[PDB]
Ligand binder design. Structure first.
Ligand SMILES: O=C(O)CN(CCN(CC(=O)O)CC(=O)O)CC(=O)O
Length: 126
């Protein structure tokens, strides 16, 4: 029932792929209740995600930097990147009491995993 929007479907990193480059995702909370999101990276050695977990207020949009750290050599044109990012969103109706989102995410997940809104963002090279 949560009106949460996660975008985009595919993050596109352009050549040269031996150079650092930042793409951006977005999580928009169009519901009337604050949510919390976490981003899991399938290839953490090559990407840095900021923020990896945070709260989104009603009507707020959080842009997430996905920083590709580059590769040692340019890859083949036919090569198909298999890296993915799982964005998971949950209700966050309890005050964090100063703790971070990651610190509470285990309990929040154990409570609301059935109501989680998830999106798998793919990665392609260009
Ligand atoms: O996502 C956007 O709207 C902004 N994009 C649009 C332009 N993109 C296309 C893409 O994301 O595949 C790069 C480009 O084609 O120059 C810029 C970016 O990638 O940082």
């Amino acid at each position: 029932m949560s009106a949460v929007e996660i975008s985009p479907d595919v993050l596109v990193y352009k050549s040269p792929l031996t150079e650092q480059s930042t793409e951006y995702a977005s999580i928009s909370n169009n519901s009337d209740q604050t949510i919390a999101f976490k981003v899991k990276t399938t290839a953490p050695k090559f990407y840095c995600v900021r923020p990896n977990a945070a709260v989104v207020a009603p009507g707020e949009t959080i842009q997430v930097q996905v920083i590709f750290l580059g590769l040692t050599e340019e890859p083949a044109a036919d090569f198909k990147c298999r890296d993915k990012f799982l964005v998971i969103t949950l209700p966050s109706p309890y005050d964090l009491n100063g703790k971070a989102v990651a610190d509470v995410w285990s309990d929040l997940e154990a409570e609301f995993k059935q109501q989680a809104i998830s999106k798998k963002i793919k990665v392609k090279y260009l």
